[PDB]
Design a protein around this ligand. Structure first.
Ligand SMILES: [Zn+2]
Ligand SMILES: [Zn+2]
Length: 67
């Protein structure tokens, strides 16, 4: 038993592999899968909605939503 919340507690240890399924990402994937938030996923979890991405693609300004 090794307890003690110290150091850092992350999940993205090796971008090389997805951050959700930890699958192997080819040279191309690693680039494609990559995201803006700061995490790399596979061709299945590459999309933002897939990993409830925190980033906001809808930027470059703001406006009224309610209609
Ligand atoms: Zn994945
Ligand atoms: Zn993201």
């Amino acid at each position: 038993g090794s307890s003690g919340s110290s150091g850092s507690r992350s999940k993205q240890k090796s971008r090389r592999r997805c951050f959700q399924c930890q699958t192997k990402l080819e040279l191309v994937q690693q680039e494609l899968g990559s995201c803006r938030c700061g995490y790399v996923f596979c061709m299945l979890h590459r999309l933002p909605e897939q990993h409830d991405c925190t980033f906001d693609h809808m930027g470059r300004g703001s406006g009224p939503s309610s209609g």
